[PDB]
Each structure stands twice: as structure tokens, then as C-alpha cells.
Write an enzyme that holds these catalytic residues in place. Structure first.
Site, PDB file in Angstrom:
ATOM      1  N   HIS A 239       0.807  -1.215   0.000  1.00 48.59           N
ATOM      2  CA  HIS A 239       0.000   0.000   0.000  1.00 48.59           C
ATOM      3  C   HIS A 239       0.842   1.267   0.000  1.00 48.59           C
ATOM      4  O   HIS A 239       0.319   2.339  -0.328  1.00 48.59           O
ATOM      5  CB  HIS A 239      -0.938   0.038   1.210  1.00 48.59           C
ATOM      6  CG  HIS A 239      -1.921  -1.087   1.256  1.00 48.59           C
ATOM      7  ND1 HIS A 239      -2.502  -1.617   0.125  1.00 48.59           N
ATOM      8  CD2 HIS A 239      -2.436  -1.775   2.302  1.00 48.59           C
ATOM      9  CE1 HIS A 239      -3.328  -2.588   0.472  1.00 48.59           C
ATOM     10  NE2 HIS A 239      -3.305  -2.705   1.787  1.00 48.59           N
TER      11      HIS A 239
ATOM     12  N   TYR B 145      -3.794 -11.982   9.317  1.00 49.36           N
ATOM     13  CA  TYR B 145      -4.053 -11.501  10.669  1.00 49.36           C
ATOM     14  C   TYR B 145      -4.674 -12.522  11.611  1.00 49.36           C
ATOM     15  O   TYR B 145      -4.588 -12.325  12.829  1.00 49.36           O
ATOM     16  CB  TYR B 145      -4.942 -10.250  10.616  1.00 49.36           C
ATOM     17  CG  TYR B 145      -4.372  -9.198   9.692  1.00 49.36           C
ATOM     18  CD1 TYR B 145      -3.372  -8.337  10.126  1.00 49.36           C
ATOM     19  CD2 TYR B 145      -4.805  -9.090   8.377  1.00 49.36           C
ATOM     20  CE1 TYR B 145      -2.834  -7.384   9.281  1.00 49.36           C
ATOM     21  CE2 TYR B 145      -4.273  -8.139   7.524  1.00 49.36           C
ATOM     22  CZ  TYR B 145      -3.288  -7.289   7.982  1.00 49.36           C
ATOM     23  OH  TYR B 145      -2.756  -6.341   7.138  1.00 49.36           O
TER      24      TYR B 145
HETATM   25  N1  Q7V Z   1      -9.229  -4.524  10.470  1.00 50.85           N
HETATM   26  C1  Q7V Z   1      -9.005  -3.141  10.146  1.00 50.85           C
HETATM   27  C2  Q7V Z   1      -7.918  -2.905   9.087  1.00 50.85           C
HETATM   28  C3  Q7V Z   1      -8.368  -1.813   8.125  1.00 50.85           C
HETATM   29  N2  Q7V Z   1      -7.340  -0.957   7.463  1.00 50.85           N
HETATM   30  C4  Q7V Z   1      -6.722  -1.280   6.179  1.00 50.85           C
HETATM   31  C5  Q7V Z   1      -5.889  -2.552   6.092  1.00 50.85           C
HETATM   32  C6  Q7V Z   1      -4.640  -2.450   5.229  1.00 50.85           C
HETATM   33  C7  Q7V Z   1      -4.114  -3.819   4.805  1.00 50.85           C
HETATM   34  C8  Q7V Z   1      -2.616  -4.011   4.791  1.00 50.85           C
HETATM   35  B1  Q7V Z   1      -2.193  -5.406   4.194  1.00 50.85           B
HETATM   36  O1  Q7V Z   1      -3.115  -6.463   4.655  1.00 50.85           O
HETATM   37  O2  Q7V Z   1      -2.223  -5.371   2.726  1.00 50.85           O
HETATM   38  O3  Q7V Z   1      -0.845  -5.772   4.628  1.00 50.85           O
HETATM   39 ZN    ZN Z   2      -3.786  -7.216   3.019  1.00 48.95          ZN
END
Ligand code: Q7V
Ligand code: ZN
Ligand code: K
Ligand code: K
EC number: 3.5.1.48
Length: 634
Positions: free
Chosen positions: A137, A307
Site C-alpha cells: 500500500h 491476521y
Molecule cells: N481490520 C481493520 C484494518 C483496516 N485498514 C486497512 C488494512 C490495510 C491492509 C494491509 B495489508 O493487509 O495489505 O498488509
Molecule cells: Zn492485506
């Protein structure tokens, strides 16, 4: 010549964390790193990978993809209290800063470059970096979505500069859109970016029109950006593999990358609270495996998201397993993609049809994965008698024992009364003994045996396979005759590549009469990725039987066929080649052993692509994984 896999990791990257209340970043925890590394060590995978140390990315390397103004601002974060970090973080979307995050961000970037140099210097075959923060991102002048520096964007630019590469493939299977990578290579036709992502008609973060399938890139690099938007949650293994068979792989193999970089976010896996998809951790064993024939295996996997800490560790181990070349898990329950997936598959192929040849003609609990382990000896080779061959370190010969020798005698008197040739009788003794060692013994994975009579050889190999037992057997045969293969009990599927046009009435048979010419190899790869692999994956065979007749343009494609088809049946594939061909024999053994596969480097004839879509029309109702469009409601 390259061998081994690099695991780049450092516990220092787990030493920054969120310091205030913010539900939009609570899930991004340092335990993501510690859980996945220990899962690798618990399953003995980390010990089998060369541990390349991490680096700090230099300022000159950071500036490859980021502006000085942004780099200077991040460089000031180690001197801030938490109040000043709060004020600095609110100036960006869904990202927190820590006193140590600039330190780790340089380490996450340097780790990616260490992986790139280890793979491009041939010091390893491939590898994975377990980095934190994520990167995809991150943008030229902005931190975004837990990302500070675009790690994957560095690797491509870094590999472009220091190794002068012309074609780099970035595969982003994180559940989020890597808009930072797309922005950075938007007009670059040398870096082909592909990303599927939870879109939900732009209602899911980061809510960008450019995340849609419309965005094919700008200017000179149009058609080198491929977005596959998921518009519903709960995407399954069938949706992910349909995405590979019908979008990514057709494009990826025509592109012929010199290096592959994976934005490996595992928030696309079952049970992840952020992606809410339904693919099992085993799917990444195949997403990895299907890509490794590209760029002679030069593949650098870089961690992004993921996650659910249980879902995360399982998906990491499945990726490193396939990176080390361990057998792939059998995927059960495959079928058609959902209507929403088929809708976005349909739209991407339509808009990309202006640029890519394979499309031009269109103009929460889950079971713990079964234990994966390499065989004691991966491949067993049976060349003709008195033919000594140099074999890789994981390939042996044959020594028929008494009980196996009695079985060929029992078979002879029943179905081959007149068979007196003692050369055929030794081939059947080997076929049984290696099949015995593949199926039950678990000490051997696959094998390859050179045969004399094709008719007798196939029966014993197949019939002895089914009673061992093998629930299902996929047969892949390159030849023009008829074979003693009954295809009606739903136990056997036959793929035949022939030179004579033939009609097929059975829906458990796929015959491809490919036009002889220069076209042959380009048309074969389309049928492999778009017809053979989807059917075989839904079939889920217990064994793959490869058969080649003596009557040779199979050399170019047979290596990738052998490597890719090893995603089926836990890689237990036995190959029968009629007659002795030193090059052909050494090619299959090389591919069966898990060695690197030499790349390919046109476009097929409409006479062939029509033959293939008629095969798809004839079979996709039975084998839904063949579908690349939404079915029409009657
Ligand atoms: N549960 C709340 C999270 C919401 N905010 C955006 C997440 C960005 C993702 C980053 B990655 O997964 O690409 O590393
Ligand atoms: Zn992601
Ligand atoms: K993605
Ligand atoms: K691009």
C-alpha cells in the site's frame, strides 16, 4: 545449478507496535512475525532453508520508489514521543508509526533486497522474507495501510537496475489491492503486476476506482496491470484456482518473466477477519507450485498481510513447503467458481483481450492440514538394461523381489498367455515395484520407466494402480493409437494429445488434436493452463499416469507439463515412455526430481484455439472449474 531456499527473518522487525486506541490498526501486531517463524521451526521448515541475514535498505535504494520529502519525514519519526507519532499517523490512511518503525521499515526493505540478491546471484533457487511492516500500500510520498515503504516495488526496481532485467512478474495475492505497486509501475511494461483483492464494488478499503478491472495500466505499459476484483466475500479454493487457470497463468506464461516476486498476504486465507475469504491454507501450496516453472524457479516471496494467527502460520508453512519442493496436498471439493467470481473473471479477460494472446479470440474452524514431507528418494528411474545415466542426487534406479516377481507371473497367465518376451516381463516387474514404492511405501514419490510394448505396459500400470488402491487415476497420453483404458466408471480420466482429429463422446476424456507446426508449443500451453489443469484439479486423482509413444516437438512443453501436473495426486506421477530417447528421458527425470525448468520464450492458430473452446463447451458443464464465464440462466 541453483539449489536451496532462503528464509530471511529477524526478530527486530517484531519490535514496533500500536501505542494508542485505533481499531483500524489493532490487527497488525508483531505476533504475526513471531507466530509464523516459530510455525516454520516447529514443522522443521526453517531448519531446511538457508538463513540469509537482514539488511538496512540504503537511502539510495529507498529513493528508487519514494520521494525525498517523504523519506525525510519518516526519518524524523524515531525522535517523536507518542503524541507526535499520533499526529504524524493521522495524516495518512490506516497506518500507525512507532519509535522503531523507521528502523524496521529499512530492515523490511533490506530483507527483500537480500532475498533478491540471493536468488539472482544463483546462491539459492528461491526464498521467502518474513517482513513487517507490509509494503504494497505504500506510495511514492505516503504511508498507507500499515505500509511505510513499498518492499515489493523496491525488489523489482532493484532487480531492474542491478541485473538489467526486462520482464518481472509481481503476483499480489494479499486480500487487499496493492495500489502502491500499481501506481509505481502503471506505465512500466517491464513489470507486469497482477492482484486479486476484496473489492465489493469499491465498498472495501482502499475504495479506489483504479482497483477495478478497468485499470489495465497507462500508456506504454497498458495491459501490464491486471486487477481481479472480488465482489463478494467467502471466495473458495475453486475461485482462486479459476483465477490462476483463466487469468494469471495464461498471461504469466506468455509474458515469460525473468523473475517472479510474490506479495504474499495471507489475509486471503480462511478465518482471516479482514479478508473474510474461505480458501484453505493448502491453496497457497498450489499458488506457489503453479508459479515455480516461471523464470527457472527464481521466485522471491515477501510477506504482506495475514491476521488470523492460526490461519497465518498454516499458510506460511504451505508456501515454504512448496518452495522447498515438497509434495503438494491434494485439494478436494473443487468445482466451478461462484457467479460473482465468474463475473470478474469474465470482465478481466474481456478488457485484457486487446493485449494478451490467450484472450485475443474473445474480440471459524477448519481441519489442520495433513503432514507434508519429501520422499526418501523423490524419483526412481528405470532406463533400458545396460544404459548407465547420470542422475540427480534424489534419483535412483529400479531389484525386483520374490513377491513382486510372482505377481507378474500371475498376471501373465491370466491376460497375456502368448507374452514370452522376457524384456517386457522385466518392465512390468519394475512398473509394479516402483508403483508399490510410490503408493504404499511412501519412501518414493514419483518415477519414470522406459517400456517396450505400450499396450501391455499401460494395462498393468493402470490396473495395478486401481487395486493398490488408487481411488482415481488421471492418464495423460501423447500418442495417436487407442489405449486399453476404460473411461466409464468415473475412476479414470484420459487426456490424449494426438495428431489425428477425433470426436469425443465421453465426458471423462479430453482429446487435443493440435495442428502440427511452429504453433504447436504455444497452443499446447494454452490447453495445459486452460483445460488440462482445471479438469485435473477438479478430478483430484490419486495417481498420474504419463504415457508417450515413440513417434518430436514434446521436448519444449513436456517439462512444464510434468512439473505442473505434479500438483495433482501429491506429485505421485509414473511416466512410461516408449523407446529410448536420452534427451526425453533426462528431461522427464529432471522435471520429476524437482529441478529447475528451462523457460520457453508466440501466439497459437485460430484453428487450434477454436478446437480448445469447443472442448471447453463440451466439458465445462461436467467440470465447472473449466468455466471462464458466467453460466446463462435458462
Ligand atoms: N481490520 C481493520 C484494518 C483496516 N485498514 C486497512 C488494512 C490495510 C491492509 C494491509 B495489508 O493487509 O495489505 O498488509
Ligand atoms: Zn492485506
Ligand atoms: K492483492
Ligand atoms: K505494469
Amino acid at each position: 545449478a541453483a539449489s536451496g531456499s532462503a528464509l530471511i527473518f529477524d526478530e527486530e522487525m517484531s519490535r514496533y507496535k500500536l501505542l494508542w486506541t485505533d481499531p483500524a490498526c489493532e490487527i497488525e501486531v508483531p505476533e504475526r512475525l513471531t507466530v509464523s517463524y516459530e510455525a516454520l521451526r516447529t514443522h522443521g521448515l526453517a531448519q531446511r532453508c538457508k538463513a540469509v541475514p537482514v539488511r538496512q535498505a540504503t537511502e539510495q535504494e529507498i529513493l528508487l520508489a519514494h520521494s525525498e520529502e517523504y523519506l525525510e519525514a519518516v526519518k524524523q519519526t524515531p525522535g517523536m514521543n507518542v503524541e507526535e507519532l499520533m499526529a504524524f499517523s493521522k495524516k495518512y490512511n490506516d497506518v500507525y508509526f512507532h519509535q522503531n518503525i523507521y528502523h524496521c521499515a529499512k530492515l523490511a526493505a533490506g530483507a527483500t533486497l537480500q532475498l533478491v540478491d540471493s536468488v539472482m546471484k544463483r546462491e539459492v533457487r528461491n526464498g521467502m522474507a518474513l517482513v513487517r511492516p507490509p509494503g504494497h500500500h505504500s506510495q511514492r510520498s505516503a504511508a498507507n495501510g500499515f505500509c511505510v515503504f513499498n518492499n515489493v516495488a523496491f525488489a523489482a526496481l532493484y532487480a531492474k537496475k542491478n541485473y538489467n532485467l526486462n520482464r518481472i512478474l509481481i503476483v499480489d495475492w494479499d486480500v487487499h489491492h496493492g495500489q502502491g505497486i500499481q501506481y509505481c509501475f502503471e506505465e512500466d511494461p517491464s513489470v507486469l503486476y497482477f492482484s486479486w483483492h476484496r473489492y465489493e464494488h469499491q465498498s472495501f478499503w482502499p475504495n479506489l476506482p483504479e482497483s477495478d478491472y478497468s485499470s489495465v495500466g497507462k500508456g506504454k505499459g497498458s495491459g501490464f496491470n491486471i486487477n481481479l476484483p472480488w465482489n463478494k466475500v467467502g471466495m473458495t479454493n475453486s475461485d482462486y484456482l479459476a483465477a490462476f487457470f483463466h487469468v494469471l497463468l495464461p498471461v504469466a506464461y506468455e509474458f515469460d518473466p525473468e523473475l517472479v516476486i510474490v506479495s504474499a498476504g495471507f489475509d486471503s486465507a480462511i478465518g482471516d477477519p479482514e479478508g473474510e475469504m474461505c480458501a484453505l491454507p493448502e491453496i497457497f501450496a498450489h499458488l506457489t507450485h503453479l508459479l515455480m516453472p516461471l523464470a527457472a524457479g527464481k521466485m522471491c516471496v515477501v510477506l504482506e498481510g495475514g491476521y488470523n494467527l492460526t490461519s497465518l502460520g498454516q499458510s506460511v508453512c504451505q508456501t515454504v513447503h512448496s518452495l522447498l519442493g515438497d509434495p503438494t496436498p491434494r485439494i478436494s471439493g473443487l468445482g466451478t467458481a461462484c457467479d460473482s467470481a465468474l463475473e470478474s473473471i469474465q470482465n478481466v479477460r474481456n478488457v485484457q483481450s486487446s493485449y494478451w494472446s490467450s484472450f485475443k479470440h474473445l474480440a471459524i474452524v477448519w481441519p489442520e492440514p495433513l503432514k507434508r514431507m519429501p520422499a526418501s528418494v523423490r524419483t526412481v528411474v528405470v532406463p533400458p538394461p545396460g544404459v548407465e545415466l547420470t542422475l540427480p542426487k534424489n534419483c535412483q534406479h529400479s531389484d525386483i523381489s520374490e513377491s513382486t516377481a510372482k505377481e507378474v507371473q500371475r498376471i501373465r497367465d491370466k491376460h497375456f498367455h502368448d507374452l514370452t518376451d522376457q524384456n517386457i516381463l522385466r518392465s512390468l516387474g519394475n512398473i509394479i515395484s516402483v508403483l508399490d514404492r510410490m503408493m504404499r511405501s511412501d519412501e518414493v514419490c514419483n518415477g519414470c520407466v522406459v517400456v517396450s510394448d505400450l499396450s501391455v505396459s499401460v494395462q498393468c500400470a493402470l490396473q495395478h494402480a486401481l487395486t493398490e488402491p488408487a481411488e482415481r487415476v488421471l492418464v495423460v497420453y501423447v500418442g495417436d493409437g487407442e489405449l486399453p483404458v476404460k473411461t466409464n466408471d468415473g475412476k479414470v480420466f484420459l487426456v490424449q494429445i494426438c495428431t489425428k482429429e477425433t470426436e469425443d463422446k465421453c465426458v471423462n476424456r479430453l482429446t487435443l488434436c493440435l495442428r502440427e507446426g511452429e504453433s504447436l508449443t504455444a497452443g499446447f500451453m494454452q490447453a495445459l493452463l486452460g483445460l488440462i489443469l482445471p479438469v485435473a484439479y477438479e478430478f483430484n486423482p490419486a495417481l498420474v499416469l504419463g504415457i508417450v509413444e515413440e513417434t518430436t516437438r514434446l521436448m519444449r512443453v513436456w517439462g512444464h507439463m510434468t512439473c505442473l501436473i505434479q500438483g495433482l495426486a501429491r506429485g505421485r506421477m509414473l511416466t512410461l515412455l516408449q523407446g529410448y530417447d536420452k534427451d526425453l528421458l533426462e528431461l522427464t527425470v529432471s522435471a520429476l526430481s524437482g529441478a529447475s525448468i528451462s523457460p520457453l520464450g508466440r501466439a497459437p492458430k485460430p484453428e487450434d484455439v477454436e478446437m480448445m473452446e469447443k472442448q471447453r463447451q463440451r466439458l465445462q458443464e461436467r467440470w465447472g472449474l473449466l468455466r471462464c464465464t458466467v453460466s446463462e440462466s435458462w
